[PDB]
Design a protein around this ligand. Structure first.
Ligand code: FDE
Ligand code: FDE
Ligand SMILES: C[C@H](CCC(=O)O)[C@H]1CC[C@H]2[C@@H]3[C@H](O)C[C@@H]4C[C@H](O)CC[C@]4(C)[C@H]3C[C@H](O)[C@]12C
Ligand SMILES: C[C@H](CCC(=O)O)[C@H]1CC[C@H]2[C@@H]3[C@H](O)C[C@@H]4C[C@H](O)CC[C@]4(C)[C@H]3C[C@H](O)[C@]12C
Ligand SMILES: C[C@H](CCC(=O)O)[C@H]1CC[C@H]2[C@@H]3[C@H](O)C[C@@H]4C[C@H](O)CC[C@]4(C)[C@H]3C[C@H](O)[C@]12C
Ligand SMILES: C[C@H](CCC(=O)O)[C@H]1CC[C@H]2[C@@H]3[C@H](O)C[C@@H]4C[C@H](O)CC[C@]4(C)[C@H]3C[C@H](O)[C@]12C
Ligand code: FES
Ligand code: FES
Lengths: 359, 359
């Protein structure tokens, strides 16, 4: 039976092999929803070529590529299997991967969905917390695709554009934290400090009204409530690049600082992505946990497992899609308010693209 | 009957009359738990003198003084009345006001609690969200007081050091929001944008690990959940001082930005203080809602009522104290973790002062 409902899973993606690194960086530096540069068509390929060796070396250090596509596929398969049973009236469901910067690209996915002759398409961001740099850019890509192709969609669109507090997402995080706490020496368990770590944003983005830091904070509070405040925590921010101001405190500085202050038993929790990727596998596991932590005299540093293949996680995904379908919503109320200092003309067009959909 | 349990309500306070402005600012610029200045004992008097006229003029514009003490007293009286019935084994209860920068000073309150011959003293911060600049400074004052008099306390101490998501606090905010939405023209209600406004922090404080922005964000999310996401929102940060980087976006710029982008129906919600004070009555009500709003072409700008004398709020205070007593807690789990980059030696001493209490 040919698919009726398509679920477009949106994420930035990551290079699957070392050879994919250059083009990943090229698309990233070309993305005007992420950043603007002078002579950008000329300077993007230059930054790409320059930064490829360094990024290739990071991927080499974790086994030679990003597991993002593997994990997304596994999650998508599990989601669809559940959706066919939850929602027989919208079945068969099919998932499509729409990566922003690697194949399959958002635009390739839309093309395939349109060729597949779907009745309905759901833009399902894989970032639980909304940033204009992440979910916003992916949704802008969908608007721009139709705008540049010069045709209206042949399917009904809607979006699940954020889900920072979904009950089953919270349960998955709390489960993975509890199981990692079990791996500390018993005598250190109550002394463990939890560092929730989410990718940082430049202050220029924070200061224009980006919703992300507040939503990430909300996920943290729900997880800690579920854990009954069993250990103390901070929310800290990783992987700032370059010399400009970004939102801190930095995850690396925090680890060092805790160690210097006698807090030598630390649990890292990636709170803003749902699968392993370069920043858990390289940055947290290698750079912070193996190198820095050792230099600083840590006693025990561990990282909670990414959600990856947890069946409760694909259950959260299917629950979200099913509730979205049942509610008839086209997007969250939050999407209807652009950043107070948004200077990107496309964000309003994208918002309208979703709110104006037939149905 | 002589009081058994003292509830020390901690708040920065504000000058009750125009003549109180100078000493208020003197104490604030002298506070080493708030800020670090070279030759601070010498510089603080010069800073206070310079800024007194500007601050006096703000207070004149709102009727000549701060209502903080009035609202604190009312809230304290209602709390005590409830506590005498909720907790007869710790009754009679007495509230004491400990303002950081005006009379009655934290130190004067402690002196009076000790003279009153209490069995138990609860340091009850009136800031629901913990910052080291606010609650931390007030709790540090308590430790420093005993350190300076060179005497141990004659009463058992404990602290309610944060309460960002207390269910009755959330219900009060949501209630006041719904009440204010009812005052917009009916035809604009769904179009209203909610701007949660909390005092900003300097980025130097944010970047050392201050807990405040994440706890404020948690209060915001719980209110919006209770409101069923009826209107879109942002959390924005008010009244940065001086030229250094502070956490944004700023409330004033956001108001201007929203107006410029066609969002002309705005509800301001003070989310991080529980009574009116100079920044609601002057900054929000006059500077932003009267002057800025008019300049930008606003259609409707309103501000949700501060919690003030709401009886449900007194009930929240009493339920917090009651739970704290029943739990036997000495402080939150969060207080047992100092900021990862804390450089104030008193924070650890204060933390130990509470965690080490007999009982
Ligand atoms: C502006 C901005 C904003 C943002 C945001 C964000 C969020 C929320 C999350 C995120 C993430 C990320 N990133 Fe992000 N971001 C950005 C950016 C960027 C850049 C520029 C890059 C590249 C880096 C280098 O080193 O080159 C990135 C990058 C990034 C990454 C990595 C990728 C690879 O290498 O593979 C990740 C994972 N990012 N992110
Ligand atoms: C560093 C820092 C931090 C902080 C924080 C905070 C929070 C959380 C809250 C707050 C608040 C406040 N403040 Fe705050 N803060 C600060 C500061 C400050 C200063 C310097 C001042 C004074 C200003 C002037 O103008 O002079 C203030 C200030 C302030 C105020 C006012 C007072 C009067 O006038 O009365 C208020 C209400 N603060 N805050
Ligand atoms: C990084 C990740 C392992 C995650 C983990 O063990 O925690 C692994 C799992 C499967 C791996 C990939 C698959 O084994 C297939 C490829 C095998 C090649 O030898 C290298 C690239 C290659 C594309 C792999 C790169 C990387 O090692 C992957 C993506
Ligand atoms: C780190 C990299 C330097 C490339 C190189 O010379 O190797 C530079 C090139 C362009 C920079 C970005 C662009 O200037 C646009 C953004 C501007 C913000 O002020 C900081 C983040 C911001 C996203 C920058 C981060 C970083 O400094 C980048 C990515
Ligand atoms: C600003 C506040 C009113 C807040 C509001 O409008 O809700 C009012 C309420 C009661 C007022 C105070 C009281 O009326 C008593 C004093 C009267 C004097 O004429 C001025 C200072 C004085 C100490 C007042 C200052 C200020 O106008 C107060 C504090
Ligand atoms: C506003 C005032 C300037 C006095 C004047 O000339 O009017 C200055 C004097 C001391 C300053 C503060 C101190 O330098 C300490 C803090 C330093 C942080 O980087 C910013 C906030 C911070 C709290 C400063 C804010 C503001 O710039 C202050 C308060
Ligand atoms: S940058 Fe946030 S809506 Fe445009
Ligand atoms: S500055 Fe936060 S604990 Fe000392």
């Amino acid at each position: 039976r040919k698919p009726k409902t398509g679920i477009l899973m949106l994420n930035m993606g990551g290079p699957e092999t070392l050879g994919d690194v250059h083009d990943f960086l090229l698309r990233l530096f070309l993305d005007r929803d992420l950043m603007t540069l002078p002579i950008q068509n000329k300077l993007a390929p230059a930054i790409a070529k320059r930064r490829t060796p360094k990024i290739q070396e990071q991927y080499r250090r974790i086994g030679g590529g990003s597991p993002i596509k593997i994990w997304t596929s596994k999650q998508g398969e599990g989601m669809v299997k559940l959706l066919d049973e939850l929602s027989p009236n919208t079945a068969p469901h099919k998932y499509y991967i729409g990566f922003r910067y690697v194949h399959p690209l958002t635009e390739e996915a839309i093309e395939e969905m349109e060729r597949d002759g779907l009745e309905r398409a759901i833009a399902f961001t894989q970032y639980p917390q909304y940033s204009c740099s992440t979910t916003g850019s992916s949704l802008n890509a969908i608007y721009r695709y139709y705008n540049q192709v010069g045709r209206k969609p042949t399917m009904k669109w809607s979006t699940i554009d954020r889900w920072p507090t979904h009950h089953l997402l919270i349960q998955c995080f709390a489960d993975h934290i509890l199981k990692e706490l079990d791996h500390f020496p018993l005598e250190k368990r109550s002394e463990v400090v939890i560092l929730f770590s989410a990718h940082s944003l430049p202050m220029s983005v924070v200061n224009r009204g980006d919703p992300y830091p507040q939503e990430v904070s909300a996920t943290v509070q729900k997880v800690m409530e579920r854990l009954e405040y069993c250990n103390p925590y901070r929310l800290v921010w990783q992987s700032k690049v370059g010399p400009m101001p970004w939102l801190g405190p930095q995850t690396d500085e925090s680890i060092k600082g805790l160690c210097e202050r006698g807090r030598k038993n630390i649990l890292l929790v990636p709170i803003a992505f749902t699968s392993d990727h370069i920043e858990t596998l390289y940055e947290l596991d290698i750079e912070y946990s193996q190198v820095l932590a050792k230099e600083c005299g840590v006693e025990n540093i561990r990282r909670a497992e990414s959600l990856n293949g947890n069946p409760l996680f694909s259950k959260a995904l299917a629950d979200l899609v099913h509730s979205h379908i049942q509610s008839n919503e086209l997007c969250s109320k939050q999407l209807t308010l652009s950043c107070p200092l948004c200077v990107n003309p496309v964000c309003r067009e994208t918002k309208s693209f979703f709110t104006s959909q037939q149905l």
